């Protein structure tokens, strides 16, 4: 996998 903040 699920999208992650960076």
């Amino acid at each position: 996998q699920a999208s992650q903040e960076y």
Partner: nanobody
Framework: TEVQLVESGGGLVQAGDSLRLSCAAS????????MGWFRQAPGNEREFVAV????????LYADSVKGRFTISRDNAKNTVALQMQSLKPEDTAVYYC??????????????????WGQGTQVTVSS
């Protein structure tokens, strides 16, 4: 460059009204980019508003607009939208759309966006 992001839909509204911004993107593989909206008011630094991942499966909103603004994308038409409701004077700004190359990720950090539109003015009267 060959990449172009063109924002539209700005205008003058009364506090409490709604407005829908759109960005038309060309010259890039649109489905591979996170798309963000940013805004800058006179004498202030440009700031984060919202971002949507390349897949569209995740959205993130600035605290000041969460619950009022909605970001969406149309990968078949290469467009991004920002639906703005319950507008306030503090929302007056030039609104920019920007593209960040890469799937499965999203960021508030402006330095990470490769491409920027030229902006559309939103003005909210008391």
């Amino acid at each position: 460059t060959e990449v172009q992001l063109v924002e539209s839909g700005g205008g003058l509204v009364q506090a409490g009204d709604s407005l829908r911004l759109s960005c038309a993107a060309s010259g890039l593989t649109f489905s591979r980019y996170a798309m963000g909206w940013f805004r800058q008011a006179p004498g202030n630094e440009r700031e984060f508003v919202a971002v949507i991942t390349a897949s569209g499966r995740t959205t993130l909103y600035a605290d000041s607009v969460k619950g009022r603004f909605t970001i969406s994308r149309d990968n078949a038409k290469n467009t991004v939208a920002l639906q703005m409701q319950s507008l306030k004077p503090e929302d007056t700004a030039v609104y920019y759309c920007a593209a960040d190359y890469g799937t499965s990720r999203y960021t508030r950090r402006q330095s990470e966006y490769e491409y920027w539109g030229q902006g559309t003015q939103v003005t909210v009267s008391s």
